[PDB]
């Protein structure tokens, strides 16, 4: 059987970070990710990315590697056509953990499966469209640096801006939103708390934004997941859409998020629990009445093209937050999406997710 | 020219004789009055689908479905088969969520063409969790004698699960019907299917009867009508066995509600109620909500049935398989599909699409 999985290889994917559009970078961070290569018995190669992020859920580069080395056995000798069974077997074999290693494996599998079929991964997911419009992140920091980044972004076509708020440097938030809004007044704002706010603090921030004139399109995970009360409060009161990220870790979370009104939008990420889980979270969310958002960790072109294919294929996504390749200094890959400012195009992808290592 | 654009959709009569009429709660089908939909791609790939509307189930007819497909042609012809979800979304919107059987035919024919030209079996497309299923078989309305008979024949062929139709014109039969069945197939699990032609009162009593005869009633299926939500709730609470929503679970939305209201513990998913896209969403909401999954159908040939088996076996996770209508048809106008060995359905020989091919047509180009 030409689809049996023959080998799973794992190597470093260390990709330097820079600030988009020229600006002064600083101390030089790197995205410490992994490239997973799945090889079928007929020689087909599929490709996936593990982008673990410690600050999001404690997963790490070496930990993901050790994870995939372990899962390797449970995958080798299985049929790639049995993709959902393998994803199940991966889940059982990791105790439900190690979401980024499993994501890399499932992506590599589906990439191999669809590319040998002559099929684009966007079509596999449904091909509702091939075009997305992404937001771009305004990196935390000065009121004056946020001004300049809002300015540059607007200059390259970006009309939707995701602004990190709270936590470290939170006293500056009001000034930041001031400067960003005055710099890019035509621009839409996503206020992303990453669980860093009290309910009261997030309300005051939205209220200040709107009194300025800013179109606040969305308030993202303002309070921590365990603050169900804060999530319900903010959703009830904000008068804008509120997104669950941490509060939407499973399909069972989105039923709860729906039934309690803890948010109106779900941020879905492939890296969190893999493609099988993410496909279920999206159907439950759409059934339950909530808006759909596609996101990611700090991902190269490979993992983001994959997310793009999922979102474009499934259709019906209101928010797209897939800007991470703009923050990368190098690109070790051929193919993938085509970007024109916020405009993302998958028209050109004809086989799997179309990304291949140079 | 893009190979996967839809150049032509045909629709033709698919009339297959039933040996005996297929009796449900107030409804007999004496012919399967279905349609065959053929989608042809620009590269020449043919994809095949089946509309099996069942008037007695939800009011769709052969001719209603035929006219609906024709009205929908523009949402289909000239569209890319790679965009199957956009096509289903556009059929669903131009239909208002009606015309389920026509929409299933079309999405089935598109997916069939998309996968076959790609050399991908449909069960693989759906997830490939397995390639084998075990079907129940149905003991349809009539005397308590032709049921006694039917139950022994099924038990001998290997059927460990029996679905007994109940209610309607002949509901005095049911209590004895179930006696004659348990005695003849003592190893057999039972599904009592009401097709909404009962009250709660009856449903619960009819269970209780069966329970104390020693019968393993494994499921009570939709005993009350679709908009008796209180009755579904009551039977789910007091029955003591699993309850399936069928008529009450036509959208993923209904399934969320069925879960939250505790109106069933099981969902009967059919490709034909709302098409394949609707069905994918319902399966996910159903496992999310903790509901068991049942894969069922209308009165379908080998074509729509194999599509369903590819769906259920690809997805994995199904507790009930009720895919037994080809057993009731006096002919099989198709080659390929699942291989059947009594209750056993095998999909291993399906190499591309659903593997089914046929052995005046409405013809639609542009």
Concatenated DSSP letters for A54-66? HHHHS--HHHHHH
Contacts of B119 in chain A (CB under 8 A): 117
CA angle B263, B269, B274 (to 5 degrees): 110
* CB-based contact B83 A259, cutoff 8 Å: no
Number of Cβ pairs < 8 A linking chain A and chain B: 101
Residue B316, chain A, CB below 8 Å: the answer is yes
- Enter the tokens of residue A273: 């629990």
Residues of chain B with CATH 3.20.20.120: 120-366
Q: What is the resolution of this structure in A?
A: 2.4
- The H-or-E segment that residue A279 falls in is helix A275-287
Interface of B with A in 128-157 (CB under 8 A): 128-130
- B242-270 burial, b at 16+ Cβ within 10 Å, e below that, comes to bbbbbbbbbbbbbbbbbbeeebbbbbbbb
Task: Bin A341: left if φ > 0, else alpha if -120 < ψ < 50, else beta.
Answer: left
CA dihedral B158, B161, B162, B167 (to 10 degrees): 180
By annotation, the residues of B acting in catalysis are 165, 270
Task: Report the DSSP beta bridge partners of residue A292.
Answer: A266, A317
d(CA A11, CA A108): 13
How many Cβ atoms from other residues are within 10 Å of residue B15's Cβ?
A: 14
The sign one gets for the Cα dihedral B233, B239, B240, B241 is: negative
Tell me how far apart the terminal alpha carbons of chain B are, to the nearest angstrom. Answer: 13
B131 touches B346 (CB < 8 A): yes
* E strands in chain A: 5-16, 30-40, 45-50, 131-133, 136-138, 160-164, 188-192, 215-220, 241-244, 265-268, 291-294, 317-320, 333-334, 338-340, 343-345, 356-357
Mutate to test the interface with A, among B269, B285, B352, B353 (most CBs of A within 10 A): B285
End-to-end Cα, chain A, rounded Å: 29
Provide the CATH topology of domain A119-358.
Answer: TIM Barrel (3.20.20)
CATH 3.30.390.10, chain A: domain bounds: 1-118
Q: What is the C-alpha to C-alpha distance for residues B81 and A233, in angstroms, rounded to an integer? A: 45
Residue B260: which of A259, A286, A314 has the nearest Cβ?
Answer: A259
Place of tokens 């069933």: B264
Contact list, A354 vs chain B (CB under 8 Å)? none
Report d(CA A318, CA A320) in Å as an integer. Answer: 7
Check the annotation: does A192 bind a ligand.
Answer: yes
Q: Residue holding tokens 């009606």? A: B98
* CATH 3.20.20.120 domain span(s) along chain A: 119-358
CA dist., res. A132 & res. A351, Å (int): 19
> Please, what is the Cα angle at B278 between A96 and B99, to 5 degrees?
170
CB B141 within 8 A of CB B84: no
3-state secondary structure of B34: strand
Rg (alpha carbons) of chain A, rounded to whole number:
20
Strand partners, B344: B134, B341
Q: Which of A119, A251, A316 sits opposite B118 (nearest CB)?
A: A119
A245 among the known binding-site residues? yes
Residues of chain B with Cβ-Cβ distance to A252 below 8 Å are: 288
**Which experiment gave this structure?**
X-ray
Q: What kind of fold does domain B120-366 have according to CATH?
A: TIM Barrel (3.20.20)
Phi, psi of A68 (to 5 degrees): -65, -45
The answer to whether B287 and B317 have CB atoms below 8 angstroms apart is: yes
Q: How far is B126 from chain A (nearest CA, A)?
A: 8
Answer yes or no: are the C-beta atoms of B326 and B332 closer than 8 Å. Answer: yes
Output the DSSP codes for A53-104: -HHHHS--HHHHHHHHHHHSTTTTTSBGGGHHHHHHHHHHHHTT--HHHHHH
**DSSP for residue B83:** G
Q: Report the C-alpha gap between A44 and A228 in whole angstroms.
A: 46
Cα-based angle A176, A182, A184 (whole degrees, multiple of 5): 100
Kindly give, in sequence order, each residue whose CB lies less than 8 Å from that of residue A297, ignoring residues fewer than 6 positions away. Answer: A51, A52, A53, A56, A100, A269, A271, A303, A324
User: CA-CA distance, B262 to B242, in Å (whole number)?
Assistant: 11
Q: Is A280 on the interface with B (CB under 8 A)?
A: yes
Instruction: Quote the tokens at residue B341.
Output: 């060995």
Q: Is B87 on the interface with A (CB under 8 A)?
A: no
Main-chain dihedrals φ then ψ at residue A37, nearest 5 degrees: -115, 120
| 3-state SS, residue A156 | coil
B193 is in an annotated binding site: yes
Tell me if B87 sits within 8 A of A127, measured CB to CB.
no
Question: Do residue A129 and residue B86 have CB atoms under 8 angstroms apart?
Answer: yes
Across the interface, whether the CB atoms of A287 and B255 are under 8 A apart is answered: yes
How far is Cα B258 from Cα A147, in angstroms, rounded to an integer?
50
Beta bridge partners of B192: B164, B220
Distance CA A242, CA A239 (A): 9
Cβ–Cβ gap A284/B280 under 8 Å: no
Kind of pairing, strands A215-220 and A241-244? parallel
- Tell me the C-alpha distance between A343 and A157, whole Å: 9
Residue in B83, B114, B285 closest to A284 by CB: B285
Chain A residue numbers touching B285 (CB-CB < 8 A): 283-284, 287
Three-state secondary structure call for residue A177: helix
C-alpha span between A166 and A202 (Å, rounded): 9
Query: Looking at chain A from residue 172 to 201, which residues have their Cβ under 8 Å from any Cβ of chain B?
Result: none
User: Any CB–CB contact under 8 A between B280 and chain A?
Assistant: yes
Q: Smallest Cβ distance to B85: which of A88, A258, A315?
A: A315
Q: Per CATH, which fold does A1-118 belong to?
A: Enolase-like; domain 1 (3.30.390)
Inter-chain touch B128–A82, beta carbons under 8 Å: yes
Residue corresponding to tokens 């042809």: B40
* DSSP category for residue B121: B
Q: Which of A85, A122, A259 sits opposite B316 (nearest CB)?
A: A85
Q: Looking at the complex, does the CB of residue B256 fall below 8 Å from at least one CB of chain A?
A: yes
DSSP H helices, A142-237, are 143-155, 173-183, 199-212, 228-237
**Contact predicate A261/A289, CB 8 Å:** no
Please name the residue that has the structure tokens 């039933």: B18
Chain B residues within an 8 Å CB radius of A115: none
Q: What is the chain A residue with the closest CA to B254?
A: A287
A164 has catalytic annotation: yes
Contacts of B144 (CB under 8 A, 6+ apart): B173, B176, B177, B179, B180
Sequence-separated (6 or more) residues with CB below 8 Å from residue B326: B300, B301, B302, B305, B332, B340
Distance from CA of A192 to the nearest CA of B (A): 27
CATH number (3.30.390.10, 3.30.70.20, 3.40.225.10, 3.30.70.141) of B1-119 reads: 3.30.390.10
């Amino acid at each position: 059987t030409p689809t049996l999985i023959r080998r799973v290889s794992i190597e470093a994917l260390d990709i330097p970070l820079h600030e988009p559009f020229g600006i002064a970078g600083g101390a030089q961070e790197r995205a410490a990710n992994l490239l997973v290569t799945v090889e079928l018995a007929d020689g087909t190669l599929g490709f996936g990315e593990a982008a673990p992020l410690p600050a999001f859920n404690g997963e790490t580069q070496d930990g993901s590697r050790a994870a995939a080395v372990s899962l390797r056995e449970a995958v080798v000798g299985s049929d790639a056509r049995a993709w959902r069974a393998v994803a199940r077997a991966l889940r059982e074999a990791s105790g439900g953990g190690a979401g980024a290693a499993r994501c890399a494996i499932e992506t590599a599998i589906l990439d191999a499966l669809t590319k040998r079929a002559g099929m684009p991964l966007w079509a596999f997911f449904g091909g509702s469209g091939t075009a997305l419009t992404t937001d771009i992140t305004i990196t935390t920091g000065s009121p004056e640096r946020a001004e300049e980044a809002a300015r540059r972004a607007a200059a390259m076509g970006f009309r939707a801006l995701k602004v990190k708020v709270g936590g470290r440097l939170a006293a500056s938030d009001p000034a930041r939103i001031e400067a960003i809004h005055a710099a890019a007044p035509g621009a839409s704002l996503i206020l992303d708390g990453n669980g860093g706010l009290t309910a009261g603090e997030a309300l005051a921030l939205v209220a200040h934004a709107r009194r300025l004139g800013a179109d606040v399109a969305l308030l993202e995970q303002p309070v921590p997941r365990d603050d169900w009360d804060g999530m319900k409060e903010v959703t009830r009161r904000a008068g804008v859409d509120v997104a669950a990220d941490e509060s939407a870790a499973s399909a069972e979370d989105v039923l709860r998020v729906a039934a309690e009104r803890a948010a109106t939008v779900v941020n879905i990420k492939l890296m969190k629990g893999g493609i099988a889980e993410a496909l279920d979270i999206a159907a439950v969310a759409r059934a339950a009445g909530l808006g759909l958002m596609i996101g990611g960790m700090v991902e190269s072109v490979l993992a983001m093209t994959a997310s793009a294919c999922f979102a474009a294929g499934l259709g019906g996504f209101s928010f797209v937050d897939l800007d991470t390749p703009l923050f990368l200094a190098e690109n070790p890959f051929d193919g993938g999406f085509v970007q024109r400012g916020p405009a993302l195009s998958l028209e050109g992808i004809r086989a799997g997710h179309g990304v291949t290592p140079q």
